[PDB]
Write an enzyme that holds these catalytic residues in place. Structure first.
Site, PDB file in Angstrom:
ATOM      1  N   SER A 149       0.826  -1.219   0.000  1.00 19.60           N
ATOM      2  CA  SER A 149       0.000   0.000   0.000  1.00 19.60           C
ATOM      3  C   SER A 149       0.859   1.269   0.000  1.00 19.60           C
ATOM      4  O   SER A 149       1.652   1.464  -0.920  1.00 19.60           O
ATOM      5  CB  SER A 149      -0.980   0.008   1.176  1.00 19.60           C
ATOM      6  OG  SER A 149      -2.149   0.731   0.828  1.00 19.60           O
ATOM      7  N   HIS A 208      -7.433  -5.892   0.473  1.00 16.11           N
ATOM      8  CA  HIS A 208      -6.197  -5.120   0.576  1.00 16.11           C
ATOM      9  C   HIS A 208      -5.439  -5.501   1.856  1.00 16.11           C
ATOM     10  O   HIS A 208      -5.985  -5.415   2.955  1.00 16.11           O
ATOM     11  CB  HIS A 208      -6.588  -3.637   0.606  1.00 16.11           C
ATOM     12  CG  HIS A 208      -5.460  -2.685   0.417  1.00 16.11           C
ATOM     13  ND1 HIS A 208      -4.686  -2.641  -0.729  1.00 16.11           N
ATOM     14  CD2 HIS A 208      -4.986  -1.685   1.213  1.00 16.11           C
ATOM     15  CE1 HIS A 208      -3.791  -1.679  -0.626  1.00 16.11           C
ATOM     16  NE2 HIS A 208      -3.958  -1.083   0.546  1.00 16.11           N
ATOM     17  N   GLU A 266      -9.097  -5.526  -4.075  1.00 19.81           N
ATOM     18  CA  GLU A 266      -8.441  -4.351  -3.498  1.00 19.81           C
ATOM     19  C   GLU A 266      -9.401  -3.374  -2.822  1.00 19.81           C
ATOM     20  O   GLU A 266      -9.049  -2.744  -1.816  1.00 19.81           O
ATOM     21  CB  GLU A 266      -7.621  -3.610  -4.560  1.00 19.81           C
ATOM     22  CG  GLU A 266      -6.403  -4.376  -5.069  1.00 19.81           C
ATOM     23  CD  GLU A 266      -5.211  -4.304  -4.114  1.00 19.81           C
ATOM     24  OE1 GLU A 266      -5.292  -3.580  -3.092  1.00 19.81           O
ATOM     25  OE2 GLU A 266      -4.181  -4.961  -4.399  1.00 19.81           O
TER      26      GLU A 266
HETATM   27  C1  B3V Z   1      -1.790  -1.502   6.480  1.00 22.04           C
HETATM   28  C2  B3V Z   1      -2.821  -1.297   5.375  1.00 22.04           C
HETATM   29  N1  B3V Z   1      -4.231  -1.507   5.885  1.00 22.04           N
HETATM   30  C3  B3V Z   1      -4.666  -2.921   5.704  1.00 22.04           C
HETATM   31  C4  B3V Z   1      -5.911  -2.938   4.813  1.00 22.04           C
HETATM   32  C5  B3V Z   1      -4.449  -1.017   7.290  1.00 22.04           C
HETATM   33  C6  B3V Z   1      -5.442   0.185   7.212  1.00 22.04           C
HETATM   34  N2  B3V Z   1      -4.938   1.327   6.362  1.00 22.04           N
HETATM   35  S1  B3V Z   1      -5.636   1.539   4.843  1.00 22.04           S
HETATM   36  O1  B3V Z   1      -4.848   2.545   4.213  1.00 22.04           O
HETATM   37  O2  B3V Z   1      -5.752   0.288   4.198  1.00 22.04           O
HETATM   38  C7  B3V Z   1      -7.189   2.151   5.113  1.00 22.04           C
HETATM   39  C8  B3V Z   1      -8.302   1.330   5.306  1.00 22.04           C
HETATM   40  C9  B3V Z   1      -9.587   1.814   5.538  1.00 22.04           C
HETATM   41  C10 B3V Z   1      -9.817   3.196   5.589  1.00 22.04           C
HETATM   42  C11 B3V Z   1      -8.720   4.018   5.406  1.00 22.04           C
HETATM   43  O3  B3V Z   1      -8.842   5.416   5.427  1.00 22.04           O
HETATM   44  C12 B3V Z   1      -9.563   5.931   6.519  1.00 22.04           C
HETATM   45  C13 B3V Z   1      -7.420   3.543   5.168  1.00 22.04           C
END
Ligand code: B3V
Ligand code: B3V
Ligand code: B3V
Ligand code: B3V
Ligand code: NAG
Ligand code: NAG
Ligand code: NAG
Lengths: 533, 536
Positions: A200, A438, A325
């Site tokens: 990501s 994701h 995703e």
């Molecule tokens: C480490 C990456 N993930 C796993 C999916 C942990 C969460 N971070 S994210 O960027 O995927 C995300 C998800 C949901 C809403 C979001 O913005 C409020 C941002």
């Protein structure tokens, strides 16, 4: 005391800890400082190299997690909490971690450097899913992971100012990388074979190191899992960053750049986090308030411009996506969606969901999207409308940016390997309708199924071992293919002509052609002309 | 009379007729050819609505086809059967308002369902006398009464100065209507049932059929309708009053006639051939599948655009059969798109494809054009010449026929009509066009009319059987409003087209197969998105 657990690096002496992996011990050195604590008047500023220390520094525990927003949508739920900070929050958080086999390698060993994701607003190298012991024990790799500043602390920018020039969180990463060059040989690492991998926002960080010259002497190969430096969410223009910072300041009562940043520096950390989400120009998902900025410095131009004109002849890249995703993001703001029901939506809710998932779209652009993704054989079927909503988000933010990157790199001389990850974990706690979300390839790459206490299936253990081998073989050689296995079938390089990529799942590799080719042509070729008018 | 065939003598409103006994393979049929239904629209009557034919004295000989309406004659492939079969096969004249009738021999006992054929030809050409429109097979094998009429085409049929008295427009359609009234009054004399009249036609003939559906005074004149590869809606079948006026004014200038009264009076002094020679020079862009003089939205025959009219109409008791052939666009490519020929494979470059799209979609802005190119490109093989060739054909076919049909089937079904849809996929073993053209526009017609029953024509045995099946469908539909045979539940059924299920059938050598969705994804592009785009 154990002489395997004692290392001298440029700054002084370290004591690591002997950890147990299912098939043997590993040496871990956790919480090593690579920078002066970016606190007080160092807030928003580039990092400075850590001053030398006396005696033996204790490197047996994870250090603090960088100050960040903590998720509350589903309190106590495993599938969300697995990403939440698992140590104390602090602005004093610039430390890195190193796993190596026990005893330390006899020969200089290829290094993998993990850059965590989390939308440039969250994340930490201490999460269980980033446990480097398995790759170290099974594949004999030296694994490194650093913490870097996130949110306002890492990416608040007043472009042109001396006191908040933007991108400091990326500079944190770069300092960690310099640290590896200078010190990794003492652990048995080969600084002349360094592979970055990330997911990501981490993948996008990796991409920005590719695109930023001072980072180029610090690594040799790159892996970008479900993220790109190009695309809609990973960067902002100088003007939009200035707007957001100025807005956040006003929101917290502050107040020239110097005056404004001085007042921000006096604010307690959580006061900034409290208003972080209030500066987005539109209601949206997959958008983040403080992300890398096109500064003319770290990034000389937009990622798109830079991938179009670059020369990548001696670079090797592994890039890929998971099967679903978009699904994860829908439950965080799109009406009709929940992890607790099947999220079957109306046609109207699908049109509303699109304005949110593509918040920069004109009415006409959003219409184009709706008309493209509607199945006109079943235009009102809730199951399809749901799956399409997810696809719109996944394609717009990950799949098509990835397809664009892969193609530009290949065309510009780079050696590219591409994948799609299609296995859904047996232990997954999210509902079935979200499929393979994701982030859910990570646990397999890091080899977590090897931990018998985690209850993965025997086939999942075998699968995890396959993926660890691809990743490490790529690290060793720039080619994920086993140089021993003569009955595969082979993973071919992605090219602009053939557009070959492989599916990763419980069955053997299958070669496919065209990564959402028709749909990504819509996103990557048509939509920009539409918005340009 | 005295020593002639007593079965060949009939009286109609205008007087007595003598017909001819024709041989069909399975027995004889009665034919009455060249029956006048209007005063000759010549001289001061050019451009004018038709007037009903005044009664004649004596027995009018109705044993031969009459004149073909004055029209452009195709010169692209001289001597070539593929083109010649559509060319006039009688003398060209402005005196051409005649119709033809085929009936069983002897004429039927009880009142018989009537089929009325309206030829196509882009509203600039065509004739009811052509070999592919021979009504003898349907008359003999199915016992139908078949009627076909000549109607004015090109400038003579469609030149308009909207609002004027001397060129009100659409007179070609009023010719058609006049023939429909003639059938109502006279068809009973031949054993036809004026209470069961089914219109069918192909291309511009199909569009004509649709316009009669959409025009109130035609509605008492028929009961059911078949539209083969054409629709009154869509990009070619109509022009606005403004555009019609512009084209007529331009053509006038080109021939020497620089208010409306004096202009039209000058045009009436022009030799017919002079008008034909300049007909093509009034199109606003280089184009294919566009025709200079076509029906105009006048606020009279057509109270509004066909699009508006099929959106708001009540079609409760209407049964309709509609459909398309497999390769609607291929025929048109050799008449204008560089790279295309009947005499080679027509493998084209990407450049040639981009150029072809501007010609095939002549009203497109640059952006719309690019949307088209992006939608039809195969992004796995964007430079592949075979694909590009086939995509060019699909663009032209989808834009002009397949999607307008889809739209028509959809709207009519939603407004209460009973709709049956088909795709015709069989390519005649006798076809003279090259293979790459597939099943081109117009090449189902010879099967509907039963030409493969003529043993001299060299069709296969399977094609003969196939033709009989199609004749059955068409005549069953004429009879009952349903193409299915009630005495044949064993054979697979042809379900109605509905918005909910979007069913249609394949027409080929194999038994009926039911498919869903008439190019649903692609037509959503043409029918829903493109209009929004051109707006802005
Ligand atoms: C480490 C990456 N993930 C796993 C999916 C942990 C969460 N971070 S994210 O960027 O995927 C995300 C998800 C949901 C809403 C979001 O913005 C409020 C941002
Ligand atoms: C042969 C071309 N040289 C020297 C001119 C430029 C470096 N070329 S590269 O392909 O090794 C490369 C490109 C971009 C980012 C990289 O990360 C290390 C590596
Ligand atoms: C012809 N009344 S109707 O619904 O059968 C109807 C509606 C419109 C046109 C027509 C003939 C018939
Ligand atoms: C009605 C019968 N058709 C063939 C189906 C005879 C040709 N007429 S056409 O309108 O289909 C046509 C085709 C190609 C090029 C053209 O130039 C305008 C016109
Ligand atoms: C799913 O749950 C959310 C809130 O819990 C609700 O808004 C939505 O309507 C639900 N969907 C279904 C299937 O009822
Ligand atoms: C086919 O013929 C046309 C006309 O002569 C020509 O323009 C085109 O280049 C030819 N294409 C091929 C495949 O030879
Ligand atoms: C059918 O075959 C015969 C064989 O001599 C040929 O003469 C005739 O031309 C063919 N029919 C047509 C219409 O070409």
């Amino acid at each position: 005391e154990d002489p395997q657990l004692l290392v001298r690096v440029r700054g002084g002496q370290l004591r690591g800890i002997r950890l147990k992996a299912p098939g043997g011990p590993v040496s871990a050195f956790l919480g090593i400082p690579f920078a002066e604590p970016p606190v007080g008047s160092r807030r928003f500023m580039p990092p400075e190299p850590k001053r030398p220390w006396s005696g033996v520094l204790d490197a047996t525990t994870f250090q603090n997690v960088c100050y960040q927003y903590v998720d509350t949508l589903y309190p106590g739920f495993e599938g969300t909490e697995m990403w939440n900070p698992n140590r104390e929050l602090s602005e004093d958080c610039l430390y890195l971690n190193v796993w190596t086999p026990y005893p330390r390698p006899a020969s200089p060993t290829p290094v993998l450097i993990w850059i965590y994701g989390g939308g440039f607003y969250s994340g930490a190298a201490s999460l269980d899913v980033y446990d480097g012991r398995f790759l170290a024990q099974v594949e004999g790799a030296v694994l490194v992971s650093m913490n870097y500043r996130v949110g306002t602390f890492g990416f608040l920018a007043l472009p042109g100012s001396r006191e908040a020039p933007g991108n400091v969180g990326l500079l944190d990463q770069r300092l960690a990388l310099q640290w590896v060059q200078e010190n990794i040989a003492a652990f048995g690492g080969d600084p002349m074979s360094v592979t970055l991998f990330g997911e990501s926002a981490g993948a996008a960080s990796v991409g920005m190191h590719i695109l930023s010259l001072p980072s180029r002497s610090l690594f040799h190969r790159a892996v970008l899992q479900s993220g790109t430096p190009n695309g809609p969410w990973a960067t902002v223009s100088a003007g939009e960053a200035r707007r957001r910072a100025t807005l956040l300041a006003r929101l917290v009562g502050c107040p020239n750049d110097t005056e404004l940043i001085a007042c921000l520096r006096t604010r307690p950390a959580q006061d900034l986090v409290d208003h972080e989400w209030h500066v987005l120009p539109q209601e949206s998902i997959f958008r983040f308030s403080f992300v890398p900025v096109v500064d003319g410095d770290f990034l000389s131009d937009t990622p798109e411009a830079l991938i179009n004109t670059g020369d990548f002849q001696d670079l090797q890249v592994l890039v890929g996506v998971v099967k679903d995703e978009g699904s994860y993001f829908l439950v965080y703001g799109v009406p009709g969606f929940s992890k607790d029901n099947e999220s079957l939506i109306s046609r109207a809710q699908f049109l509303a969901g699109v304005r949110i998932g593509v918040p920069q779209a004109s009415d006409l652009a959003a219409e184009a999207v709706v008309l493209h993704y509607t199945d006109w054989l079943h235009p009102e079927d809730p199951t399809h409308l749901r799956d399409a909503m997810s696809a719109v988000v996944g394609d717009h933010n990950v799949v098509c940016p990835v397809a664009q990157l892969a193609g530009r790199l290949a065309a510009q001389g780079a050696r590219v390997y591409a994948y799609i990850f299609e296995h859904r974990a047996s232990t997954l706690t999210w509902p079935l309708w979200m499929g393979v979300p994701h982030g859910y390839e990570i646990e397999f790459i890091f080899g977590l199924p090897l931990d018998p206490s985690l209850n993965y299936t025997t086939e999942e253990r075998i699968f995890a071992q396959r993926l660890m081998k691809y990743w490490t073989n790529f690290a060793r050689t720039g080619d994920p293919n086993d140089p021993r296995d003569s009955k595969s079938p082979q993973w071919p390089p992605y090219t602009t002509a053939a557009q070959q990529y492989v599916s990763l799942n419980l069955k053997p590799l299958e070669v496919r052609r065209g990564l959402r080719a028709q749909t990504c042509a819509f996103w990557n070729r048509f939509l920009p002309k539409l918005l340009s008018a």
